[PDB]
Design a protein around this nucleic acid. Structure first.
Ligand SMILES: [Mn+2]
Ligand SMILES: [Mn+2]
Ligand code: NA
Length: 346
DNA sequence: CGCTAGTCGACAT
DNA sequence: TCGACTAGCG
């Protein structure tokens, strides 16, 4: 997530209700509903005790969407991106830590703080997600498991015209170049909408409303793929991109000390990390629902070599990609754990 | 003013 | 998990 982005472009935000998308299709970052639903039953989940409260929690959101004549496409996270394995491990350590020390806090008597310990140990597994998938598909609601991060898949679904809006809590969608993003939606449909074309309402944003420059801004400020240079936030990065009339971002980053009047040393591997971040935001592998084939988020440009983009995910056979996307194949064991067929009755 | 790093709440009784 | 919020510091 782009920390502070939502407050940085608040002028482009608008309080809405989902009724305005009646008769249209809306994709959903289901992992947020999964997490907020897991919070209610974090105790049983952390203990391994059987529960399915989060299923109902997600399904009342889904039902709420269905009640207003909206077609929801639930999208789920798939395989972990190779550039975040260390990160996921480092987070898993914290989860297990809060789990154990949570159990010890239960041993010592306080539960209100122990609650706060168990709520930070929540690990959304693919099994839970699959439970939600079955629960939704029993209602005729489409479900699609992303090849990797659901962010890029959602971005594709929106930029292709399959859906007209995206329900999420993560601002990464804005960096992926989404047209419309619905944030902070409760059980009743009251949410906050951000339009890409409305980014012009932000005065301090300057002329950084174009998708490319906006992406550059989000990356330079600091994202999940690359940590920002110490002292570089959203405002200063935006200032750099505003003061830079040069289309070549590399020379700009090399002159980031010049555009800001600061003693900023730019390491040579930071440029590599930046290029990788941009290529990940641009060409992360998604799944085409129509053609049923692994494709990059955006079409490969004539300058970039697609052979050196393994950090954006590697390709597999389209059949395997299909069985993975349908949730029929386990992401980890690559074994058939289901046999859904959308044909015999996205 | 801007940025870093840490805290805190979410759900729900 | 992610944003909101804030003390501390350039
Ligand atoms: Mn995500
Ligand atoms: Mn994200
Ligand atoms: Na930053």
């Amino acid at each position: 997530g782009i920390q502070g982005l939502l407050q940085f472009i608040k002028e482009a935000s608008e309080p809405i209700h989902v009724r305005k998308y009646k008769g249209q299709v809306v994709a959903v970052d289901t992992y947020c509903w999964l997490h907020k639903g897991a919070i209610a039953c974090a105790e049983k989940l952390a203990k391994g005790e059987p529960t399915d409260r989060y299923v109902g929690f997600c399904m009342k959101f889904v039902n709420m969407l269905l009640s207003h004549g909206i077609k929801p496409i639930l999208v789920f996270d798939g395989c972990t991106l190779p550039s975040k394995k260390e990160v996921e491990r480092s987070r898993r350590e914290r989860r297990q830590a809060n789990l154990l020390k949570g159990k010890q806090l239960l041993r010592e008597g306080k539960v209100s703080e122990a609650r706060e310990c168990f709520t930070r140990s929540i690990n959304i597994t693919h099994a839970m997600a699959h439970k939600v998938i079955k629960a939704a598909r029993s209602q005729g609601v489409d479900c699609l498991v992303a090849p990797y991060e659901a962010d890029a898949q959602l971005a594709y679904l929106n930029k292709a015209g399959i859906v007209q809006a995206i329900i999420t809590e993560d601002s990464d969608l804005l960096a992926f170049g989404c047209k419309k993003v619905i944030l902070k939606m409760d059980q009743f449909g009251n949410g906050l909408e951000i339009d890409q074309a409305r980014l012009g309402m932000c005065r301090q944003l300057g002329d950084v409303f174009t998708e490319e420059k906006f992406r550059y801004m989000c990356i330079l400020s600091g994202c999940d793929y690359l940590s920002s240079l110490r002292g570089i936030g959203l405002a200063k990065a935006c200032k750099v991109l505003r003061l830079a009339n040069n289309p070549d971002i590399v020379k700009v980053i090399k002159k980031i000390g010049h555009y800001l009047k600061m003693n900023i040393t730019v390491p040579e591997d930071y440029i590599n990390g930046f290029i990788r971040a941009n290529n990940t935001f641009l060409y992360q592998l998604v799944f085409d629902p129509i053609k049923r084939k692994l494709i990059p988020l955006n079409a490969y440009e004539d300058d970039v070599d697609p052979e050196t983009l393994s950090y954006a995910g590697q390709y597999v056979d389209d059949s395997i990609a299909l069985q993975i996307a349908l949730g029929n194949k386990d992401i980890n064991t690559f074994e058939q754990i289901d046999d859904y067929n959308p044909d015999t009755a996205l």
